[PDB]
Amino acid sequence: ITGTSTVGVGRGVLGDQKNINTTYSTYYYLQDNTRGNGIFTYDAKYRTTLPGSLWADADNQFFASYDAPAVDAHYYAGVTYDYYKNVHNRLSYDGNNAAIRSSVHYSQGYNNAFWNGSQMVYGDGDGQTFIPLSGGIDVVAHELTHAVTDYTAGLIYQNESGAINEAISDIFGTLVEFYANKNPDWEIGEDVYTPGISGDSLRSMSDPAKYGDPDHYSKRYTGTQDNGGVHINSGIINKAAYLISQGGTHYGVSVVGIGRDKLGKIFYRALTQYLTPTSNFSQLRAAAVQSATDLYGSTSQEVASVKQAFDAVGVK
Ligand SMILES: N[C@@H](CCCC[NH3+])C(=O)O
Ligand SMILES: [Ca+2]
Ligand SMILES: [Ca+2]
Ligand SMILES: [Ca+2]
Ligand SMILES: [Ca+2]
Ligand SMILES: [Zn+2]
């Protein structure tokens, strides 16, 4: 809509209070004009028709429990925008400030969120397995990172290429968690998964086998479920990103950690410069080793730790 840039306030899924960029024209719209061609948040109103209606509010106050998922979808899209702009000099998901569109209240009891090729979609969950999935900054950053991947490497959402795709989304989901610096971790979806059970998560990068995901190439899933295990074989790359950042010893291979900034730079460079739609794990190692070499030189600790990390999860 055409209108005035303004600042509203509301509560997120977790009851946290935050300010949100709105646009005034009769109603206050969840439209942020401060970021590229803007960030727009829509109400799917418990239906599967997309995007639904641009989120509208009479008083610019978003404190109803109905409002909570919209507040987080809108705010965490902004933090994610800021991360790619400030840390990687990237303007929105397409590199040219494309409008970022989110719909919340998708379907009834929907225990998922997705990038549909055009926009992000968040369910409310059933209240048991999930609460509203926009509540997780790692979830919002994960789904918008699918958009980045689609406009860069274009990794095919199948087999090894699909697993790298899933891994990139978990890596950048987590680095956006750390950039926003609330209670960041190396787990995926802890904030919105199983509200009755504390301490658990959907997936773990630090120890993927905790949730039944392989942490070594030799334990890879080769069946057809989950498009050839895109959410499963992602553990092998997830664990490698974790060792590169934090270090550790895994099946007796020692890796010196180089921290989150360097991990980000290396994997962003691999994503935008070397990876292709059909890239496998082996070509991801080569891409990640070339990126560290470009950035830090062939003889650096940074290149050594990428090599030791890919060695540790059994990727030659
Ligand atoms: N995003 C993962 C986990 C979601 C929870 C399962 N309903 C997937 O779709 O496989
Ligand atoms: Ca209101
Ligand atoms: Ca957390
Ligand atoms: Ca997390
Ligand atoms: Ca839980
Ligand atoms: Zn994903």
Question: Solved how?
Answer: X-ray
Nearest to 171, CA basis, from 275, 68, 69: 275
- The answer to the question of whether 193 is labelled as a binding residue is yes
Q: Where are the beta strands (DSSP E) in the chain?
A: 4-11, 17-25, 27-29, 31-32, 39-43, 53-54, 56-57, 61-62, 100-106, 113-115, 120-123, 187-188, 203-204, 248-250, 253-255
185 known member of a binding site: yes
Resolution in angstroms comes to 2.5
Sign of the alpha-carbon dihedral angle for 255, 155, 84, 135 = negative
Alpha-carbon separation of residue 199 from 11, 23, 204, 228, 246 (angstroms): 23, 38, 12, 29, 20
Report how far ligand 5's centroid is from the alpha carbon of 92 (Å): 31
Would you identify the CATH topology of the domain 6-154? Elastase; domain 1 (3.10.170)
Show which residues are catalytic: 143, 231
Q: Which numbered ligand comes closest to the C-alpha of 192?
A: 5
d(CA 230, CA 223): 11
Q: Is 57 annotated to bind ligand?
A: yes
Instruction: Place domain 155-315 in its CATH homologous superfamily.
Output: Neutral Protease Domain 2 (1.10.390.10)
Neighbours of ion ligand 2 (CB under 5 A): 57, 59, 61
Please tell me whether the peptide bond between 277 and the residue prior to it is cis, using omega within 30 degrees of 0. Answer: no
Measured from CB, residues less than 6 Å from any atom of ligand 1 are 111-112, 202, 231
**Domain-wise residue ranges, the chain:** 6-154, 155-315
